[PDB]
Automatic annotation (TrEMBL):
It comes from Sphingomonas sp. A1. Residues 9-226 form the Alginate lyase domain. One of its GO terms (molecular function) is lyase activity. Coiled coil: none annotated. Keywords: Lyase. This is Alginate lyase. Transmembrane segments: none annotated. The chain holds residues 81 to 307 of 308 of the full protein.
Amino acid sequence: PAAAPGKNFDLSHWKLQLPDANTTEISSANLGLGYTSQYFYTDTDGAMTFWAPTTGGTTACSSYPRSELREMLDPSNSKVNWGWQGTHTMKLSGKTVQLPSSGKIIVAQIHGIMDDGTCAPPLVKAVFQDGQLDMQVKQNSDGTGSDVHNYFTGIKLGDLYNMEIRVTDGVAYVTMNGDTRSVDFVGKDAGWKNLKYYFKAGNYVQDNTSTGGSAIAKLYSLSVSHS
């Protein structure tokens, strides 16, 4: 077998969340030993790949199944996360190869978290459909209300894309393929100062129907920078 993704990529600052029955989480340490399964594997082109089925497990603060990386500043403490001040950036290149029957998955996020580690809302969701990418940014830190929608066209099922998600001083900057949009989330609602944040990338499958099928998403590069 080809080298597992945590041998190819530096995953020392991520944990992996799975769409198995008991929604399992593989620590950074285990990713580093070379964890691989039907959910997470190195494909023949080298890509780090998710398979998640729509009938998979979903946990307490998720309506849908995922095979997805969750950023761990401190591999042993998921309460260590970053905030609105300074600069925090994820860059990745990827492709979505298979969709569920909904035709929709999420391929990257910035998720909110409370200081005590409890559930908070998502801040940025990279919503992938064949030929429609919506980098949605939440407006209300309490989790009510609608998102600012940011639409990019022409990115097809199977196309390689380049993505950046940066937060600088409470402004979110969302970029597909050199097209950057921004949303001043901390200027829209000072409550965002009271929350912390971490990155996510992989396959969060927006379909939980019994007949939904499964989704495959790939990453060829993934890095996080905290200026």
